[PDB]
Structure 1
Amino acid sequence: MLSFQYPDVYRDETAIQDYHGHKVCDPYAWLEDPDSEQTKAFVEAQNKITVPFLEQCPIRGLYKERMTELYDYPKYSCHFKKGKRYFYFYNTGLQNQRVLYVQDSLEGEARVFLDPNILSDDGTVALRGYAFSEDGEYFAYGLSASGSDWVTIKFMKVDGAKELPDVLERVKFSCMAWTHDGKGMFYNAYPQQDGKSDGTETSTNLHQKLYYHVLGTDQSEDILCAEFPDEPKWMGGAELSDDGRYVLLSIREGCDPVNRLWYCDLQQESNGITGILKWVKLIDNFEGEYDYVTNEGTVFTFKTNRHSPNYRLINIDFTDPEESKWKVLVPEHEKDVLEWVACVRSNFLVLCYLHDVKNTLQLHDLATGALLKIFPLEVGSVVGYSGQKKDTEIFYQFTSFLSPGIIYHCDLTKEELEPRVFREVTVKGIDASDYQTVQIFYPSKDGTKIPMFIVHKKGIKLDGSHPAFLYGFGGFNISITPNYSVSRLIFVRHMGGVLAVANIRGGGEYGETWHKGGILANKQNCFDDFQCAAEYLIKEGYTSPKRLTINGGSNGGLLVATCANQRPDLFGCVIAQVGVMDMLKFHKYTIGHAWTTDYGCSDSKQHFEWLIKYSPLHNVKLPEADDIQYPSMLLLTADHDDRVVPLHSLKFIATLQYIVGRSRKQNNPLLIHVDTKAGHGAGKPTAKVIEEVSDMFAFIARCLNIDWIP
């Protein structure tokens, strides 16, 4: 099948570094420079062999045509009210970017408010964050170009959708919060740095500061409100309390669900916001998460995981702040994770729980925490919600593996609090009743039972003949819940596949203990859990090794790349998207320093010893058995992925091709595709999304010799 030659790639055999006595050679270290002629030539040479490989078979075109047809369905976000107007996002179907609409009433005619599509021919300029002023008359929005995390904040007067001159640069990983006096907005920015700041650079991001921008002024006049010069990795995000009296500063360092919480009673400022605020350091440590829900005077309600790994709601009175005095409003559930909480209609709390990786939604009384109403939902996820303290209604969006979903509306001024279907779209071409979703729990190596969702056509014989697509992430307290994917359903319908999602440790499915079970010294549990998921699918007859494809992105890319090295015999195909591959150097670039809370850092001998054992870049090794080769592998990255710098995938593919690709027994391809004007994934235009899934499934089809089923 391989009718191409892998590119020549220079090996710098002198690139040796000592890590606590262990000598590590990094012959492709030069690929860390994205601007060199050598790296640019490497990328061109790799794409030169990958593209024809993906496009040779007619199936890519068949898949692309089908994806373009089926993905073409109306996509709406929940309505949300700001001031006297309603807003909602809507994509007619194939627009590159969804459009923000506005209407003066639910029954009123909607009009385009912000259309990102006119900002670029290819849709590579996308909205990234926004904030309306408290009265809803002004609007701030971030724009990111080519998929970069960098943001430029622009402003508009809502009435007439008038563009304002205010522009904020150097914004990244930023909060956006307007003071209730309507004078300005808090946001975060990074100090100037040498080199580029467009997403192609690898420069580490440190010293993020909190600024206050007064509307109608130049950014140079912005007020510095908080900075942490002695702690370069701290990031402080601001939000205003619901009554506009306090600015709450949530300080994070790393990625664990914990934060310091400082507050500033704005009434107590000597002469408004003129400099560093009079911060009161309520919670001055990183021992727990304190997520603001609402306040009544000095009594603040926070969602927390402090000594509650499944989360709970507590009330902290600023006038009697000691922990021994905090009141538990809604106790922690023994197993269900309290995912998020919102306050609406003054005294109602909307609580969203995760029960065995499925969402539940309910309404509680703010004063007592008592359950008042349960909002019925089918098996799936709540992926959207609207309803702030002053609002008297809520909207929520539900989705699942087999249906785009439903947007519900509930008028909270009605005695019974009954919800109703507000919007429901169905995809013609896919019949949900033809498929089924089952949830099973399989034991991992250490006996821990791991959940796994499996989606397949009803009535299939479990004879191991089906191609399977197994997805996992496993980290950062992220729960992988049901979501609607037309691309995956095409694999099921048109490629006869079985879909599987394994809720391995490291995620947040069973709270902080689930998270801690897949990080630091225990990171291997993630890989073991995932490998065991594959073994379950094989043992139970859903698939066989040669027909199994695994996929993951970012930390999920690390997951599947590590699984390829550790158990090459278990998989037929591996698609690793924007993955962290160099575990010894990840902390050196952009925001990588934040991931040490999940992975550890190689500067530590203890951590290095964990990392070196699974780091994908450092564990590429020819399988010992003559009958075992590496699975077909496709790495997908982009030149503006500043979240996980592309050098990770560049160095990894060079290593795979040299160590494994040169072996005579290796007939499965080891390829990389580096896209342009794209980044980690957020904000990617529809056109690129379609091309990406077409590449993915065409790769699977060609490598596993799978015919298209019309």
Structure 2
Amino acid sequence: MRSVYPLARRSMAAYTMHNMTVPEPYDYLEDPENPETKTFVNEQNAFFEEYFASEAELRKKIFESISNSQDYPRTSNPSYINGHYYYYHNSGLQNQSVLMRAMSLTDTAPSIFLDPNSMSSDGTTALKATAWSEDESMLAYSLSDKGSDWQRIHVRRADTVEDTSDVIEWAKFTAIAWWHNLGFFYTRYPALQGDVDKGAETDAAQDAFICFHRIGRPQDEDVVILSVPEHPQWNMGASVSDCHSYVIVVLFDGCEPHNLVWVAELPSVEKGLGSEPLVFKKLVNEFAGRYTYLGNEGSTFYFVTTRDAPRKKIVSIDIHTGQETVIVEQQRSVLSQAALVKKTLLLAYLEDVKDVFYYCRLEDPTLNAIPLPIGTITSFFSDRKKDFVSFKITSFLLPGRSFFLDINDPQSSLRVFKDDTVEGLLVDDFVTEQTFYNSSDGVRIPMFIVYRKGSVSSESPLLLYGYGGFNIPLTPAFSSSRMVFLRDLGGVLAVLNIRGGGEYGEEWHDAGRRACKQNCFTDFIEGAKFLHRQGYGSPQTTAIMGGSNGGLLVAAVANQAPELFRCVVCRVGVLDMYKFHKFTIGHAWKSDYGDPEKEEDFRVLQQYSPLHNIKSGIKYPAILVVTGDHDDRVVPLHSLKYVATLQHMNPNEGGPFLARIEVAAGHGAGKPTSKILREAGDIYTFIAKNINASWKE
């Protein structure tokens, strides 16, 4: 097309930054308050709508298709307790989850057991915490209301499931710790945050204090068990031993991972509850790293330990002498969940952003694996005395699957306890896989590719998704948008974890941060080569998109191979690194970028800034940028600068320019589902339009 466009004005304004007179001809759109910027935004929306007017029919079709994937019943892990199967359910039109029991694995109609949606007229409270008991006669659960401690917490039984007259009041972030038939320890503070003589606006809730509680009795007949007197600005919890004759207590200073371990002898049943807390034997009184109790056996205890190992090794501990031994030295990856049942330690490793299971005996610690599908843990239930165990895997085209097995021979006992259903899915037809390829200089880079059973070729649309930064990896999780991409248009989804994120942790950040960050944008480009050299798809039509810093990278890769791609989408990204620290909360990511006044930081920055590298003549893909006009996460001046500059710089070359925007009235409130759903529909109909995706007819 050779049609005209609004004349994006250019001014002589040029802040001479570091003795360099960089032109800033678009000082107009550095503030929403001008009329010029508002009218330019209006014209951008009008042009995008005009471009999509003809394809609006299929756009509405795909929008309905994606919107149809927002209501979904979702189950959770099972629990075989006292001959029943307790598990969670969800219908879709409600705001909390329900809990109920089934007589067996193949129950047809379950029986409701816990409905948090009824006891309150608002019905906004939810089960914040839960705990069974040795006698299994009652489930102690916390009913948290609107976050604040002004709360109603209730209890319903099991044999009768009426509600007893017993309440736990004035507690936040509680770890209920039940012991046989007497009761449980729970957290609270002195003075019960009583009003009248009350100040501090419930700030930091000083003097955390755990005390026992016995059902049936009033609140006053309780014996305090531990409250840190000298360091009241802490937060601690407690739990009981498997023998249930001893109690252990964990403590935490602020939110520091560092932890100290304190064990204790709980008084026996024959003496009720003792008058004084017994001696709390001191094993670790330090602040090295995070500890987490997993189990015990007589004179032994076992913990997940991050001490001298940021990858959460697993170690035993002995009390009566203190001499120590190591169970599992940390592997090449990090931990997600762990458990100790009967005569096996059962572990899950977050290897290359996917959880792999292993079971370890007590003589051969070899990590014997199971062929669970590609994905990650999202839930776990395990009891030492119950041989049944279960877990839940989630992935891209695996919205959620609860599996179960025993602990005798884990090979064949693995089975699908529950599979969630969303209309229009067969699961097995979409196979996911991982593949490693060499980088630009020769370090292995992973790639999660989801694709059909060999039903795609050089002609199939190929999409890339990446965010890559801020130590936060893009773990495999379901998204309805990827669902529509896989099932509605015959495309394949390739997610690459470029250097910068939390795929390998702080080392991964070090591989792609600040000065050494630049090569990251190179390596991603190399990925586009590999996926086309192998055979999956063709460079003649391909798509990429990402968000925030990812929205940056999908634009940065426009420099190294400008012609190679065919269409890209950037969302809520940073698009001008020269106004980085001067606006909004952006400067808070200095650790990633750095200020534009440091010498070497600006020297590295100025060679890759997207607003200083778009250049005429060269060939560019089709670019879409989507942005909200007042979103304070990333101020939208950068997106408007980018789109206007290349709208008025390279007219008759590779493009075009697309500027999807979120203009409305009433900023500063929450985001309803309508906005996100319509925006996802718009971006997905754009990609489906341009990269030549064949709709499932």
- Do both proteins adopt the same fold according to a TM-score greater than 0.5, normalized to the shorter chain? yes
Unaligned runs of 5+ in 1: 145-149, 188-205, 218-222, 230-234, 254-258, 640-644
Residue among 450, 460, 474 paired with 2:445: 450
Quote the offset at 1:500 in angstroms. 0.4
**Are the aligned partners of 2:555 and 2:610 in contact in 1 as well (CA < 8 Å)?**
no
Q: Which residue of 1 aligns with 2:251?
A: 248
Letter in 2 for 1:654: L
Alignment of structure 1 residues 384-463 onto 2, 5 Å: 384-387=379-382, 393-410=388-405, 418-425=413-420, 429-460=424-455, 462-463=457-458
In the alignment, does 2:566 pair up with 1:572? yes
Seen in structure 2, the aligned counterparts of structure 1 residues 688 and 90 have a Cα distance that, compared at 3 Å, is farther
Report the counterpart of residue 695 of structure 2 in structure 1: 708
The one-letter amino acid of 2:493's match is L
Paired residue for 1:342, among 338, 342, 363?
338
- Cα 1:415–1:437, aligned 2, differ >3 Å: closer, same or farther? closer
- Equivalent residues in 2 for 1:164-179 (5 A)? 177-178=175-176
* Equivalent residue, structure 1, for 2:642: 656
- Please tell me whether the aligned partners of residues 261 and 291 of structure 2 are also in contact (alpha carbons under 8 angstroms): no
Shift of 1:468: 1.6
Is 1:59 the equivalent of 2:55? no
Deviation at 1:532, TM superposition (A): 1.9
Distance 2:688 2:248 in 1: 58
Which structure 2 residues correspond to residues 4-403 of structure 1 after superposition, within 5 A?
Answer: 45=42, 49=46, 52=49, 56=53, 57-69=56-68, 73-79=72-78, 88-92=87-91, 94-95=92-93, 97=95, 99-103=97-101, 109-110=111-112, 113-115=115-117, 130-132=128-130, 137-140=139-142, 154-159=151-156, 177-178=175-176, 182=184, 184-185=186-187, 239-241=237-239, 243=241, 245-249=248-252, 259-262=257-260, 282-284=285-287, 290=291, 293-294=294-295, 301-304=302-305, 308=309, 311-315=312-316, 327-333=325-331, 335=332, 337-345=333-341, 348-365=344-361, 370=365, 374-387=369-382, 393-403=388-398
- Quick one: distance in 2 between partners of 1:165 and 1:327? 43
Letter matched to residue 116 of structure 2? L
Q: Within the alignment, does 1:670 sit opposite 2:656 as a pair?
A: no
What is the DSSP-based 3-state SS (H/G/I as helix, E as strand, rest coil) of the residue aligned with 1:628? coil
Q: Which amino acid aligns with 2:612?
A: K
Distance in 1, Cα, partners of 2:534 & 2:402: 36
Match of 1:497 among 491, 494, 501: 491
Structure 2: which amino acid aligns with 1:131?
Answer: A
Q: Give the Cα–Cα distance (whole angstroms) in 2 for the partners of residues 436 and 294 of structure 1.
A: 38
1:523 aligns with 2:485: no
Aligned pair 1:698/2:685, yes or no? yes
Q: Secondary structure at the match of 2:153?
A: strand
Q: In the aligned structure 2, how far is the partner of 1:564 from the partner of 1:697?
A: 21
Deviations 1:379-412 (A, max 9, x none): 4333332225676543211244444453122356
SS in 1 for 2:498: coil
Structure 1 residues 648 and 69: CA distance shift in structure 2, 3 A:
closer
In structure 2, give the amino acid aligned to 1:64: F
Tell me what 1:192 maps to: none
Q: Secondary structure at the match of 1:700?
A: helix
In the alignment, the residues of structure 1 paired with residue 383 and residue 600 of structure 2 have an alpha-carbon distance, to the nearest angstrom, of 43
* Structure 2: tracts of 5 or more residues without a match: 190-202, 220-225, 242-246, 267-274
Aligned partner (choices 611, 617, 638) of residue 620 of structure 1 = 611
SS at match of 1:430: coil
Distance in 1 between residues matched to 2:4 and 2:114, nearest whole Å: 49
* 8 Å contact from structure 1 (residues 31, 647) kept in 2: no
Identify the residue that residue 632 of structure 2 maps to in structure 1. 646
The answer (yes or no) to whether the contact 1:77–1:397 under 8 Å persists in 2 is yes
Q: 1:319 to 1:20 in 2, by over 3 A?
A: farther
Which stretch shows the higher mean deviation, 103-112 or 494-503? 103-112
Flag the structure with larger Rg: 2
Larger RCO (CA under 8 A, 6+ residues apart): 1
1:584-605 CA distance string (max 9 Å, x none): 8579977985x66x62654994
One of 456, 465, 475 as aligned partner of 1:471: 465
Whole-angstrom distance in 1 between the partners of 2:436 and 2:642: 34
Q: Distance in 2 between matches of 1:591 and 1:80?
A: 45
Shift of 1:697: 0.4
- Within 2, Cα distance between the matches of 1:137 and 1:79? 16
Superposition deviation, residue 669 in structure 1:
0.9
Looking at structure 1, the residues matched to 292 and 208 of structure 2 have their Cα atoms a distance apart, in angstroms, of 21
Preserved CA contact (<8 Å) 1:301 1:313: yes
Q: Is the 8 A contact 1:133 1:182 kept in 2?
A: no
Aligned equivalent of 2:200: none
The residue type equivalent to 1:67 in the other structure is: I
Distance 1:557 1:328 in 2: 44
1:482 shift after superposition: 4.2
In structure 1, how many angstroms separate the alpha carbons of the residues matched to 2:411 and 2:455? Answer: 44
Aligned CA distance change for structure 1 residues 260 and 104 (closer, same or farther; 3 Å): same
Q: What's the TM-score once normalised by structure 1's chain length?
A: 0.68
Deviation at 1:139, TM superposition (A): 3.7
Measure how far apart 1:91 and its partner are.
3.5
Alignment length (residue pairs) = 634
Amino acid in structure 2 at the alignment position of 1:313 = I
The one-letter amino acid of 1:156's match is: I
SS of equivalent to 1:599: coil
Question: 2: distance between equivalents of 1:209 and 1:587?
Answer: 37
One-letter code aligned to 1:599: D
Give me the whole-angstrom Cα distance separating, in 2, the residues matched to 1:104 and 1:449. Answer: 47
Partners of 1:155 and 1:364 lie apart in 2 by 43
Aligned amino acid, residue 76 of structure 1: T
1:44-102: CA deviation from partner (whole Å, max 9, x where unpaired): 8599559846974222221123234466553222235899997644343x547563334
Identity %: 27
Tell me how far apart the structure 2 counterparts of residues 692 and 120 of structure 1 sit (CA, whole Å): 31
In the alignment, the residues of structure 2 paired with residue 298 and residue 10 of structure 1 have an alpha-carbon distance, to the nearest angstrom, of 77
- Residues 1:633 and 1:416: Cα distance change in structure 2 (over 3 Å): closer
- Structure 1 contact 154–166 (Cα < 8 Å) conserved: no
Distance in 1 (CA, whole Å) between partners of 2:519 and 2:603 is 12
Q: TM-score, normalised by structure 2?
A: 0.69
Shift of 1:376: 4.1
1:461-491 deviation digits (Å, cap 9, x = unpaired): 643x332211123345555454444532432
Q: Could you say which residue in structure 2 is the equivalent of 1:191?
A: none
Name the aligned partner's letter for residue 304 of structure 2.
K
Give 2:196's aligned residue: none
Contact 1:316 1:327 survives alignment (8 Å): yes
**Cα distance 1:591–1:600, how it changes in 2: closer, same or farther (>3 A)?**
closer
Indicate the residue corresponding to 1:220 in structure 2: none
Give the match's secondary structure for 1:76.
Answer: coil
Tell me the SS of whatever aligns to 2:642. Answer: helix
Rate the CA distance shift 1:314–1:281 in 2: closer, same or farther, 3 A.
closer
**Residues 442/28 of structure 1: CA separation in 2 closer, same or farther (3 Å cut):** farther
Go from structure 1 to structure 2 and tell me whether the alpha carbon gap of 1:305 and 1:550 turns closer, same or farther (over 3 Å shift): farther
Q: Partners in 2 of 1:279 and 1:585 — Cα distance? A: 50
- The verdict on how the C-alpha distance between 1:318 and 1:413 changes in structure 2, with shifts beyond 3 A counting, is same
Amino acid at match of 1:503: N
1:696 aligned partner, one-letter code? I
Native 8 Å contact 2:446 2:497 kept in 1: yes
